Amino acid sequence: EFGYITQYFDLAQVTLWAFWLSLLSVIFFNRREDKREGYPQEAVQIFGKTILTEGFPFMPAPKTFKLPHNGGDVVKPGPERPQYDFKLEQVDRFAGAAYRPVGNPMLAGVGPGAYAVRANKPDLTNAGDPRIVPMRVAKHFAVVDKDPDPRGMTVIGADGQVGGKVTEIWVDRAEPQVRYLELEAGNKKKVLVPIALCVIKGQKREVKVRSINGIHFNDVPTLSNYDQITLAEEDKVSAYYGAGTLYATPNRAESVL
Amino acid sequence: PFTPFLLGENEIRVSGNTDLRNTNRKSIKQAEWTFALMTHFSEALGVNCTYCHNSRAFMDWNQSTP
Amino acid sequence: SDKFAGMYKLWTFIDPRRTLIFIVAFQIMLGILIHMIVLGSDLNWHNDGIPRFYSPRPVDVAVGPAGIPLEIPGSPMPQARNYN
Amino acid sequence: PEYQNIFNKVQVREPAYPGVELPKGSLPRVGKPIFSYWLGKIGDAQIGPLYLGGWGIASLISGFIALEVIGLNMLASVGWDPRLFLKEFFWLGLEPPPPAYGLSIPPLAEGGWWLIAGLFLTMSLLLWWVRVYKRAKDLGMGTHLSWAFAVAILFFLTLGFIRPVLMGSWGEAPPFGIFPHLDWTAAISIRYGNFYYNPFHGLSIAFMYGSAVLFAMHGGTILAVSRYGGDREIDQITDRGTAAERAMLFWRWCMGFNASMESIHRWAWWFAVFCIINSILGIILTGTVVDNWYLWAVKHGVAPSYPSELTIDNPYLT
Amino acid sequence: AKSFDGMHKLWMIMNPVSTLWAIFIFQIFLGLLIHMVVLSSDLNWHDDQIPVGYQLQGETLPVNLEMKAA
Amino acid sequence: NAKSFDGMHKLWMIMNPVSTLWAIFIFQIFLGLLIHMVVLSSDLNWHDDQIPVGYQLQGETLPVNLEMKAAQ
Amino acid sequence: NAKSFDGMHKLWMIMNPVSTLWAIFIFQIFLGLLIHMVVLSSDLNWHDDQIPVGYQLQGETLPVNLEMKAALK
Amino acid sequence: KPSTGLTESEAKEFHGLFMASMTLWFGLVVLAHILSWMYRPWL
Amino acid sequence: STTGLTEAESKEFHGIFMASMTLWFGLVVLAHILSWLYRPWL
Amino acid sequence: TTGLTEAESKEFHGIFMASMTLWFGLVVLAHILSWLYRPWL
Amino acid sequence: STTGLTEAESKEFHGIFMASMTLWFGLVVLAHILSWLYRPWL
Amino acid sequence: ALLNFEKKYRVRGGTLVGGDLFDFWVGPFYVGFFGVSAVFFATLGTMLILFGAAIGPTLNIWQISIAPPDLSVGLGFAPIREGGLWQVITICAVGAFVSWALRQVEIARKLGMGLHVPFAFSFAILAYLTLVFFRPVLLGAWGHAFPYGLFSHLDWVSNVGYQTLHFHYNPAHMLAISFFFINTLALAMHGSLILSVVNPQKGEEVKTAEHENTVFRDIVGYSIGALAIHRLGLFLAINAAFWSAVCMILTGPFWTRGWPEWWMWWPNLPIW
Ligand code: BCL
Ligand code: BCL
Ligand code: BCL
Ligand SMILES: CC[C@H]1c2cc3[nH]c4c(c3C)C(=O)[C@H](C(=O)OC)c4c3nc(cc4[nH]c(cc(n2)[C@@H]1C)c(C(C)=O)c4C)[C@@H](C)[C@@H]3CCC(=O)OC/C=C(/C)CCC[C@H](C)CCC[C@H](C)CCCC(C)C
Ligand SMILES: CC(C)=CCC/C(C)=C\CC/C(C)=C/CC/C(C)=C\CC/C(C)=C/CC/C(C)=C/CC/C(C)=C/CC/C(C)=C/CC1=C(C)C(=O)c2ccccc2C1=O
Ligand SMILES: COC(C)(C)CCC/C(C)=C/C=C/C(C)=C/C=C/C(C)=C/C=C\C=C(C)\C=C\C=C(C)\C=C\C=C(/C)CCCC(C)(C)OC
Ligand SMILES: [Ca+2]
Ligand SMILES: [Ca+2]
Ligand SMILES: [Ca+2]
Ligand SMILES: [Ca+2]
Ligand SMILES: [Fe+3]
Ligand SMILES: [Mg+2]
């Protein structure tokens, strides 16, 4: 009879319902784990008052990370360290309007140039030593020939001008690889540039840094001690180079078409 | 596939007439032998499956072509 | 009545730019949608043949005793249909 | 343009790293580590050393016995000729017993070698499971990689051992080939009325598409903030920096909600595991509970209904 | 009967802006949905050929009839 | 059985009232849509039942439409 | 009501003129393409109506093509 | 505790206008349905 | 309190919540009586 | 905040209501023409 | 002023905007008169 | 609502079209010119799908279907009720997808990051355009594309597959499936490893990068690295999409036999 039916309820049906309920429930738990960073959120009210809201579903109860080498406990969701001192002016009088920096945009720490407030300790290896270090402190590293050694090259800066010269390489001992280039700038300071913002040309013996301009290499943040770097300093350096992607030229933040 | 089907006389049908488990006891190997014979039908005439079937139900006569 | 006299205050917590943008976009969207819903209907005015038809009209094909078009006895390809 | 971070431009070498110290009572690691320049263009250059203990030797004996059996039967099927082996390689296979033998142990050249290879491959994968568990647990880590591996092993055993036993025939299992196992796939869809109307098959396809989507999204997002140190996820988890902040603002602004640097890895875990859970559920019900998936879908109001215009006469009714 | 006295205080805990936007958007979505659900039923009013069928009216104009005859 | 629900108002000292209100409203709308669609998919459907009259059929049999279909 | 629109020029103190110009131009081009495609899908189509002549049919019946097709058989 | 920053007077004002507007909207809905029932009764 | 409401505020909220819920359920009952009069389903 | 004072809101409201009234007038006119040409109810 | 235009600049822009829109609509009307002469659709 | 740390990043600039007119947020979303475009096109497309369901036989969610024109229309314009609605919706879909990608580019420019995600999205867009534009144009008709309907585009997939007798033997199809499977495996291992390192055995410290390298070198003998696994991920997903597009552009335009017969080039090499 080709399509005769004996009974409407079967096992495939029930099992499908069970799956709909088993999904729909890992969504719940994952969405709750999503809110251990950045919450409670700030909802702005009808006439400017700000309250803390928590969303749907609600925030989870705090858990603890025990960091190694007596690096302390981290509770999440927990307290926050205080923001620094960014200045901003709103552009249009409603909660969803954008903001403008008030002073020199490069030295303001807002927009792509914002950074976080991390610990003032270096990241450690499994043995307790600082992880990112110059190649004169890590005496066992060597650049593989077949590859252009950047030490000596110049640091052209996106408008064609010279920034300085490369004098050191900063390596990562936990995973052997290059993280920073150190260079002497135009006013004879020592500044770092991340290796992921550098195009290295071996034959021209140049390093092109498209982010900032040549004269901008004088105001890159500096380090305390030059035998190690801390989490805070990493953030400051990288953020300064990221501010130039929108603030270097006055025409960069200005609608392509 | 010609010995069992075009000289012998074996059943080509393999699918069931209801949706739940019933008296049908054909296997995947018998399904493979049928698939082989159908491949020859396609090659010998210059056509595809869809010259005589709608693939979403290879066993329904109300969804075949003339 | 006089209960609606203070409705202008609406714009002290609802802003003009986003509101204007939303309204304009929505009105264009609705315009296109309603024209397409009326075109896909009996009220269609482009294709009704009033006041006159301008393109040539469809011509049917005769069928065989199996309800599909007849094959042509030396064609090197079968005949097309669209219905099965 | 700007550096995209796809290849390593400058490489550096130090002496090889032997590995985190193991608990006392362990065997040494075997091998002297070597370095690959081409592997170092895209990733880590060190190869080795390797840990071989009790469970990973029993595994590797089982697996190689299985491989020898499979290879030799494929080679006997062409008359021992290696030239023909290379010529027709994608068409060769080791075939399961004829379905009329049921669940008995058949003679060796009519399905017994298939049975031997299946048994040895099974034992290999269970010993490997124990190895993976112990390796992660001896270093003091959570055992999350063993849970997912267990799911995968269960799918291998379902199609292959559990479903053939519930049906009553070893001849319902796949063979060991390339084109032969593709033929098995098509035939089992044809026999049980169209897998496109199996709902667990649709859900697992949803989760396989989703795995590709999610991993394109995550791989992109972490390469796009690696200029702010985003590729170092453990530190971004235990001390949130600007890379994590930018990464979570991007998705919040784009689609309205976001995850954190630790939570996205739970989404990954689940999207990879639900795919295989639905695989198991869809295969285990086929044949044993449902005999025609299209007729099932018609009974539950799921299949579309094209207009007809004709009448075809079933010649078995005439 | 004086059970609903403090009701006006609702807007001291619920945001007026969010509520207004939610209501407006929901009403538009529901309007579109109900119109589409009624158009797909026997109550459809564009295709019911009342008060007259216009496609049929166009097929039977003498100008078209005389050309179809030829 | 007269005083067992006395402290019930202290519910609002552990549940946030605004969150609860929003949850209730959203759940009620979802349930409204669901029940209407479940009843519309059964024999109780009231849009297509052709009661009190079928309107498409009423339009097909108007004298003007019948006379136009005749001359064809 | 002869005076109710005179502040209208203040519109450009809250809407950016260049942004608005670009939006208008892009919308107009999209609408042009859309209406042309909608009218070409109806009985008013003017490319395929075979007026003032059908050209494919004209090519099939040229004397040269007819004489070549005859001498084939 | 969630608050909106409105005092009790501002809330009373908002409530007045909100209720007036909702009543007018429902009035228009009722009128539309009376016209539709007169033209094409559905029950 | 973990909602910030005192006991007086909770009492107030509870009063109005219960009144509103009762009115809503009343309207539901009325709708069902009309539906039973028009199209009985049991 | 939307930042508008009460005077600016009054101004905006005046022009908004005038514009909306004119738009609805044009809509009504379009529908009267359509009813004269092709009545749908 | 939120766009930076003063009131004089806004007046200027408005003048030219309205002139341009009027010219565009004039051309549209002309195109439709030609189309009606060639292929009347209503 | 804003996150704890969000306010200092909400600055103006970074846009492509428009300028300061559409540079705002609505709730958590960022709008822009392309945000307006995307929502416009999504709304219009959805409403047209619903209307095409209303003029069909049923409003059941599983059985709605809007189909493309016939093959006799060619690359022309079909009537609204017999194909033109499908064409309008397929224009809306392209508009919405491209708008989505460009909005992503604006957001990434504002936050100071690289354009990897819109670039990977481009390959999904390319696969869609292959199925609705490139393959139909090369074969000469819009009616070679798939209909819009759950369960109804699956009938298309099935019959198209069986037009070549056995579609499993398509070579680019094999290569794409390889990439899909390996991608799911890699994603499972990556998820598991990070979870395991920050959720260690009860009463232990969070582990380090050395542990991550050691575990996989112990099990398998090679560890790829924490930055290269993200690369490997972008690579496998993009390649899956790419070879899907190739496999569909091959079927019909460049090969009309069965797919098993292509492979016949291998055992016919004159070298065995
Ligand atoms: C054969 C079955 C009957 C039918 C049987 C029933 C039954 C039985 C019920 C409904 C109910 C409803 N029906 Mg009915 N209904 C039918 C046909 C329709 C059709 C239609 C297009 O055919 C529509 C559009 C409706 C729509 C509605 C809604 C007004 C209402 C669901 C409200 C809700 O979801 O609140 C959810 C949202 C909230 C709770 C949010 C908070 C609400 C706030 C406080 C204000 C909203 C006011 C609300 C719209 C009611 C207005 C009452 C005023 C005093 C005017 N029905 C057919 C004829 N219908 C339900 C109802 O009446 O509720 C009282 C109900 O029990
Ligand atoms: C067979 C069924 C009948 C039919 C039965 C009904 C019924 C019953 C109703 C409608 C209602 C509406 N119908 Mg009707 N309707 C039919 C055919 C149509 C057709 C058409 C192309 O065929 C169109 C375009 C419409 C359009 C409309 C809208 C005007 C209105 C819903 C608006 C809304 O969702 O507000 C959502 C917007 C808000 C809540 C916005 C709030 C305030 C804003 C700023 C102002 C909005 C203006 C508003 C749209 C019009 C109010 C009147 C003004 C004084 C001009 N109907 C057929 C003939 N229609 C509903 C209605 O009348 O509303 C009172 C309604 O109850
Ligand atoms: C009998 C049928 C044949 C078969 C016939 C076909 C046909 C025919 C096709 C495939 C295609 C594929 N097949 Mg096959 N295939 C078969 C058996 C298999 C088996 C198996 C285990 O047997 C597997 C694993 C596969 C796997 C695959 C993939 C390689 C490929 C699908 C991925 C893809 O196209 O991505 C590409 C991604 C897209 C097209 C997605 C587009 C994304 C868009 C841009 C974004 C949409 C957003 C959306 C609208 C937003 C919604 C928003 C909401 C708010 C959430 N096939 C059987 C043998 N196969 C397809 C292919 O390769 O096409 C290129 C294809 O056409
Ligand atoms: C959650 C589901 C996904 C998943 C998860 C998963 N697989 C896993 C794991 C996890 C979490 C492991 O931890 C485990 C592992 O240790 O990998 C590093 C593994 C593993 N999954 C593997 C493969 C694999 N997983 C697959 C699928 C999947 N794995 C799912 C998509 C597939 C597919 C889709 O076909 C394959 C082929 C192995 C690399 C590994 C288990 C290794 C093992 O059991 O080896 C011991 C036994 C032997 C046979 C030793 C003999 C020599 C072998 C032949 C060497 C292996 C080489 C490799 C398999 C080459 C591919 C050959 C094929 C082309 C035939
Ligand atoms: C439509 C309508 C009615 C509109 C009216 C509303 C109005 C008027 C305007 C609103 C304004 C605008 C412009 C809105 C546009 C938005 C709209 C309407 C719709 C879009 C919503 C949308 C497309 C959502 C789809 C969501 C889905 C299904 C996602 C699939 C993938 C998925 C399940 C992901 C979950 C995991 C997540 C969250 C991944 C993101 C994520 C990844 C991938 C990381 O790598 C990462 C790394 C480090 C930290 C964080 C992250 C992180 O969060
Ligand atoms: C020439 O080659 C030499 C010999 C030199 C070696 C080279 C090896 C080579 C080239 C090998 C090539 C191998 C290939 C191509 C293999 C292809 C494999 C594929 C694609 C296989 C796919 C699927 C097979 C599956 C899923 C099998 C599942 C089987 C199972 C689960 C078996 C279960 C059986 C059990 C548990 C045993 C029960 C037995 C008992 C005794 C209990 O019964 C009562
Ligand atoms: Ca007309
Ligand atoms: Ca009508
Ligand atoms: Ca009725
Ligand atoms: Ca013409
Ligand atoms: Fe990761
Ligand atoms: Mg076989």
Side-chain angles (χ1 to χ4, degrees), chain J residues 12-24:
Chain J
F12 184 86
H13 196 67
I15 305 194
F16 182 89
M17 286 286 132
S19 302
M20 201 175 62
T21 300
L22 175 74
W23 175 243
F24 289 170

mmCIF file with all atom_site columns, all heavy atoms in Angstrom, chain J residues 12-24:
data_model
loop_
_atom_site.group_PDB
_atom_site.id
_atom_site.type_symbol
_atom_site.label_atom_id
_atom_site.label_alt_id
_atom_site.label_comp_id
_atom_site.label_asym_id
_atom_site.label_entity_id
_atom_site.label_seq_id
_atom_site.pdbx_PDB_ins_code
_atom_site.Cartn_x
_atom_site.Cartn_y
_atom_site.Cartn_z
_atom_site.occupancy
_atom_site.B_iso_or_equiv
_atom_site.pdbx_formal_charge
_atom_site.auth_seq_id
_atom_site.auth_comp_id
_atom_site.auth_asym_id
_atom_site.auth_atom_id
_atom_site.pdbx_PDB_model_num
ATOM 1   N N   . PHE J 1 12 ? 11.268 71.111 16.824 1.00 0.00 ? 12 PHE J N   1
ATOM 2   C CA  . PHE J 1 12 ? 11.283 69.859 16.088 1.00 0.00 ? 12 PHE J CA  1
ATOM 3   C C   . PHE J 1 12 ? 9.867  69.298 15.966 1.00 0.00 ? 12 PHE J C   1
ATOM 4   O O   . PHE J 1 12 ? 9.501  68.776 14.913 1.00 0.00 ? 12 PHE J O   1
ATOM 5   C CB  . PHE J 1 12 ? 12.242 68.853 16.729 1.00 0.00 ? 12 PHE J CB  1
ATOM 6   C CG  . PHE J 1 12 ? 12.359 67.583 15.944 1.00 0.00 ? 12 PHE J CG  1
ATOM 7   C CD1 . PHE J 1 12 ? 13.264 67.477 14.882 1.00 0.00 ? 12 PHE J CD1 1
ATOM 8   C CD2 . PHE J 1 12 ? 11.510 66.509 16.226 1.00 0.00 ? 12 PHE J CD2 1
ATOM 9   C CE1 . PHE J 1 12 ? 13.321 66.306 14.133 1.00 0.00 ? 12 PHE J CE1 1
ATOM 10  C CE2 . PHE J 1 12 ? 11.594 65.340 15.492 1.00 0.00 ? 12 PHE J CE2 1
ATOM 11  C CZ  . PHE J 1 12 ? 12.510 65.235 14.452 1.00 0.00 ? 12 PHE J CZ  1
ATOM 12  N N   . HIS J 1 13 ? 9.083  69.378 17.040 1.00 0.00 ? 13 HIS J N   1
ATOM 13  C CA  . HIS J 1 13 ? 7.764  68.786 17.011 1.00 0.00 ? 13 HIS J CA  1
ATOM 14  C C   . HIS J 1 13 ? 6.878  69.503 15.999 1.00 0.00 ? 13 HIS J C   1
ATOM 15  O O   . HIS J 1 13 ? 6.120  68.835 15.269 1.00 0.00 ? 13 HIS J O   1
ATOM 16  C CB  . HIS J 1 13 ? 7.150  68.782 18.412 1.00 0.00 ? 13 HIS J CB  1
ATOM 17  C CG  . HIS J 1 13 ? 5.985  67.871 18.532 1.00 0.00 ? 13 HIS J CG  1
ATOM 18  N ND1 . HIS J 1 13 ? 6.126  66.485 18.447 1.00 0.00 ? 13 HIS J ND1 1
ATOM 19  C CD2 . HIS J 1 13 ? 4.669  68.117 18.712 1.00 0.00 ? 13 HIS J CD2 1
ATOM 20  C CE1 . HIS J 1 13 ? 4.947  65.918 18.589 1.00 0.00 ? 13 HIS J CE1 1
ATOM 21  N NE2 . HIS J 1 13 ? 4.026  66.897 18.745 1.00 0.00 ? 13 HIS J NE2 1
ATOM 22  N N   . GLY J 1 14 ? 6.940  70.845 15.985 1.00 0.00 ? 14 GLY J N   1
ATOM 23  C CA  . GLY J 1 14 ? 6.184  71.611 15.005 1.00 0.00 ? 14 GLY J CA  1
ATOM 24  C C   . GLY J 1 14 ? 6.421  71.113 13.565 1.00 0.00 ? 14 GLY J C   1
ATOM 25  O O   . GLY J 1 14 ? 5.483  70.752 12.815 1.00 0.00 ? 14 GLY J O   1
ATOM 26  N N   . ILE J 1 15 ? 7.703  71.053 13.194 1.00 0.00 ? 15 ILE J N   1
ATOM 27  C CA  . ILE J 1 15 ? 8.014  70.715 11.815 1.00 0.00 ? 15 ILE J CA  1
ATOM 28  C C   . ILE J 1 15 ? 7.710  69.244 11.522 1.00 0.00 ? 15 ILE J C   1
ATOM 29  O O   . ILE J 1 15 ? 7.262  68.915 10.415 1.00 0.00 ? 15 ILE J O   1
ATOM 30  C CB  . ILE J 1 15 ? 9.445  71.086 11.450 1.00 0.00 ? 15 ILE J CB  1
ATOM 31  C CG1 . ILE J 1 15 ? 9.708  72.559 11.728 1.00 0.00 ? 15 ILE J CG1 1
ATOM 32  C CG2 . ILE J 1 15 ? 9.638  70.900 9.953  1.00 0.00 ? 15 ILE J CG2 1
ATOM 33  C CD1 . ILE J 1 15 ? 10.965 73.077 11.104 1.00 0.00 ? 15 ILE J CD1 1
ATOM 34  N N   . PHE J 1 16 ? 7.945  68.369 12.506 1.00 0.00 ? 16 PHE J N   1
ATOM 35  C CA  . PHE J 1 16 ? 7.652  66.950 12.333 1.00 0.00 ? 16 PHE J CA  1
ATOM 36  C C   . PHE J 1 16 ? 6.169  66.724 12.045 1.00 0.00 ? 16 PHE J C   1
ATOM 37  O O   . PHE J 1 16 ? 5.801  65.973 11.138 1.00 0.00 ? 16 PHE J O   1
ATOM 38  C CB  . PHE J 1 16 ? 8.037  66.173 13.584 1.00 0.00 ? 16 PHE J CB  1
ATOM 39  C CG  . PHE J 1 16 ? 7.825  64.690 13.522 1.00 0.00 ? 16 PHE J CG  1
ATOM 40  C CD1 . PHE J 1 16 ? 8.824  63.849 13.043 1.00 0.00 ? 16 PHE J CD1 1
ATOM 41  C CD2 . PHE J 1 16 ? 6.620  64.131 13.937 1.00 0.00 ? 16 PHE J CD2 1
ATOM 42  C CE1 . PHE J 1 16 ? 8.648  62.472 13.022 1.00 0.00 ? 16 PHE J CE1 1
ATOM 43  C CE2 . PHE J 1 16 ? 6.430  62.751 13.876 1.00 0.00 ? 16 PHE J CE2 1
ATOM 44  C CZ  . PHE J 1 16 ? 7.449  61.923 13.439 1.00 0.00 ? 16 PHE J CZ  1
ATOM 45  N N   . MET J 1 17 ? 5.300  67.372 12.816 1.00 0.00 ? 17 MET J N   1
ATOM 46  C CA  . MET J 1 17 ? 3.877  67.175 12.610 1.00 0.00 ? 17 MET J CA  1
ATOM 47  C C   . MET J 1 17 ? 3.413  67.721 11.263 1.00 0.00 ? 17 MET J C   1
ATOM 48  O O   . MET J 1 17 ? 2.613  67.074 10.584 1.00 0.00 ? 17 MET J O   1
ATOM 49  C CB  . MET J 1 17 ? 3.098  67.834 13.740 1.00 0.00 ? 17 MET J CB  1
ATOM 50  C CG  . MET J 1 17 ? 3.207  67.046 14.990 1.00 0.00 ? 17 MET J CG  1
ATOM 51  S SD  . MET J 1 17 ? 2.193  65.544 14.848 1.00 0.00 ? 17 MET J SD  1
ATOM 52  C CE  . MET J 1 17 ? 3.387  64.343 15.404 1.00 0.00 ? 17 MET J CE  1
ATOM 53  N N   . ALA J 1 18 ? 3.947  68.880 10.860 1.00 0.00 ? 18 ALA J N   1
ATOM 54  C CA  . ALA J 1 18 ? 3.588  69.428 9.558  1.00 0.00 ? 18 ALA J CA  1
ATOM 55  C C   . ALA J 1 18 ? 3.972  68.452 8.435  1.00 0.00 ? 18 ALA J C   1
ATOM 56  O O   . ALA J 1 18 ? 3.151  68.172 7.552  1.00 0.00 ? 18 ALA J O   1
ATOM 57  C CB  . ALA J 1 18 ? 4.244  70.766 9.353  1.00 0.00 ? 18 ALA J CB  1
ATOM 58  N N   . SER J 1 19 ? 5.199  67.920 8.494  1.00 0.00 ? 19 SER J N   1
ATOM 59  C CA  . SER J 1 19 ? 5.676  67.031 7.451  1.00 0.00 ? 19 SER J CA  1
ATOM 60  C C   . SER J 1 19 ? 4.853  65.746 7.381  1.00 0.00 ? 19 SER J C   1
ATOM 61  O O   . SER J 1 19 ? 4.504  65.282 6.283  1.00 0.00 ? 19 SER J O   1
ATOM 62  C CB  . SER J 1 19 ? 7.123  66.703 7.657  1.00 0.00 ? 19 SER J CB  1
ATOM 63  O OG  . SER J 1 19 ? 7.905  67.869 7.673  1.00 0.00 ? 19 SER J OG  1
ATOM 64  N N   . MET J 1 20 ? 4.545  65.169 8.549  1.00 0.00 ? 20 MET J N   1
ATOM 65  C CA  . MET J 1 20 ? 3.780  63.936 8.569  1.00 0.00 ? 20 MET J CA  1
ATOM 66  C C   . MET J 1 20 ? 2.376  64.151 7.994  1.00 0.00 ? 20 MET J C   1
ATOM 67  O O   . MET J 1 20 ? 1.858  63.290 7.258  1.00 0.00 ? 20 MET J O   1
ATOM 68  C CB  . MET J 1 20 ? 3.698  63.386 9.989  1.00 0.00 ? 20 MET J CB  1
ATOM 69  C CG  . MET J 1 20 ? 3.385  61.904 10.031 1.00 0.00 ? 20 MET J CG  1
ATOM 70  S SD  . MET J 1 20 ? 3.422  61.208 11.697 1.00 0.00 ? 20 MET J SD  1
ATOM 71  C CE  . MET J 1 20 ? 2.103  62.141 12.479 1.00 0.00 ? 20 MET J CE  1
ATOM 72  N N   . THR J 1 21 ? 1.768  65.311 8.292  1.00 0.00 ? 21 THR J N   1
ATOM 73  C CA  . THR J 1 21 ? 0.446  65.588 7.769  1.00 0.00 ? 21 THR J CA  1
ATOM 74  C C   . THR J 1 21 ? 0.478  65.699 6.253  1.00 0.00 ? 21 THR J C   1
ATOM 75  O O   . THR J 1 21 ? -0.406 65.152 5.576  1.00 0.00 ? 21 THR J O   1
ATOM 76  C CB  . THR J 1 21 ? -0.115 66.862 8.394  1.00 0.00 ? 21 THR J CB  1
ATOM 77  O OG1 . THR J 1 21 ? -0.189 66.641 9.811  1.00 0.00 ? 21 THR J OG1 1
ATOM 78  C CG2 . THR J 1 21 ? -1.473 67.228 7.850  1.00 0.00 ? 21 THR J CG2 1
ATOM 79  N N   . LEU J 1 22 ? 1.487  66.400 5.715  1.00 0.00 ? 22 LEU J N   1
ATOM 80  C CA  . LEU J 1 22 ? 1.579  66.528 4.271  1.00 0.00 ? 22 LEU J CA  1
ATOM 81  C C   . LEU J 1 22 ? 1.751  65.156 3.597  1.00 0.00 ? 22 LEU J C   1
ATOM 82  O O   . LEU J 1 22 ? 1.097  64.867 2.573  1.00 0.00 ? 22 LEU J O   1
ATOM 83  C CB  . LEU J 1 22 ? 2.721  67.481 3.929  1.00 0.00 ? 22 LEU J CB  1
ATOM 84  C CG  . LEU J 1 22 ? 3.027  67.616 2.434  1.00 0.00 ? 22 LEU J CG  1
ATOM 85  C CD1 . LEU J 1 22 ? 1.974  68.450 1.722  1.00 0.00 ? 22 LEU J CD1 1
ATOM 86  C CD2 . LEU J 1 22 ? 4.418  68.144 2.171  1.00 0.00 ? 22 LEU J CD2 1
ATOM 87  N N   . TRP J 1 23 ? 2.613  64.301 4.175  1.00 0.00 ? 23 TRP J N   1
ATOM 88  C CA  . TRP J 1 23 ? 2.836  62.977 3.622  1.00 0.00 ? 23 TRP J CA  1
ATOM 89  C C   . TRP J 1 23 ? 1.542  62.153 3.576  1.00 0.00 ? 23 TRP J C   1
ATOM 90  O O   . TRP J 1 23 ? 1.222  61.527 2.557  1.00 0.00 ? 23 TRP J O   1
ATOM 91  C CB  . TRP J 1 23 ? 3.948  62.284 4.410  1.00 0.00 ? 23 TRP J CB  1
ATOM 92  C CG  . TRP J 1 23 ? 4.182  60.861 4.004  1.00 0.00 ? 23 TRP J CG  1
ATOM 93  C CD1 . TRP J 1 23 ? 4.013  59.747 4.770  1.00 0.00 ? 23 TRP J CD1 1
ATOM 94  C CD2 . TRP J 1 23 ? 4.661  60.398 2.736  1.00 0.00 ? 23 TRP J CD2 1
ATOM 95  N NE1 . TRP J 1 23 ? 4.334  58.618 4.073  1.00 0.00 ? 23 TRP J NE1 1
ATOM 96  C CE2 . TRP J 1 23 ? 4.758  58.985 2.829  1.00 0.00 ? 23 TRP J CE2 1
ATOM 97  C CE3 . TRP J 1 23 ? 5.025  61.040 1.544  1.00 0.00 ? 23 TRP J CE3 1
ATOM 98  C CZ2 . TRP J 1 23 ? 5.174  58.193 1.759  1.00 0.00 ? 23 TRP J CZ2 1
ATOM 99  C CZ3 . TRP J 1 23 ? 5.486  60.262 0.503  1.00 0.00 ? 23 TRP J CZ3 1
ATOM 100 C CH2 . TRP J 1 23 ? 5.540  58.865 0.611  1.00 0.00 ? 23 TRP J CH2 1
ATOM 101 N N   . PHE J 1 24 ? 0.783  62.176 4.678  1.00 0.00 ? 24 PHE J N   1
ATOM 102 C CA  . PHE J 1 24 ? -0.448 61.406 4.719  1.00 0.00 ? 24 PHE J CA  1
ATOM 103 C C   . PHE J 1 24 ? -1.484 61.938 3.736  1.00 0.00 ? 24 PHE J C   1
ATOM 104 O O   . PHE J 1 24 ? -2.271 61.154 3.181  1.00 0.00 ? 24 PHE J O   1
ATOM 105 C CB  . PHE J 1 24 ? -0.992 61.310 6.140  1.00 0.00 ? 24 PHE J CB  1
ATOM 106 C CG  . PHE J 1 24 ? -0.180 60.428 7.049  1.00 0.00 ? 24 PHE J CG  1
ATOM 107 C CD1 . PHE J 1 24 ? -0.425 60.412 8.416  1.00 0.00 ? 24 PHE J CD1 1
ATOM 108 C CD2 . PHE J 1 24 ? 0.830  59.610 6.560  1.00 0.00 ? 24 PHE J CD2 1
ATOM 109 C CE1 . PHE J 1 24 ? 0.290  59.569 9.264  1.00 0.00 ? 24 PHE J CE1 1
ATOM 110 C CE2 . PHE J 1 24 ? 1.575  58.790 7.409  1.00 0.00 ? 24 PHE J CE2 1
ATOM 111 C CZ  . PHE J 1 24 ? 1.323  58.786 8.770  1.00 0.00 ? 24 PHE J CZ  1
#
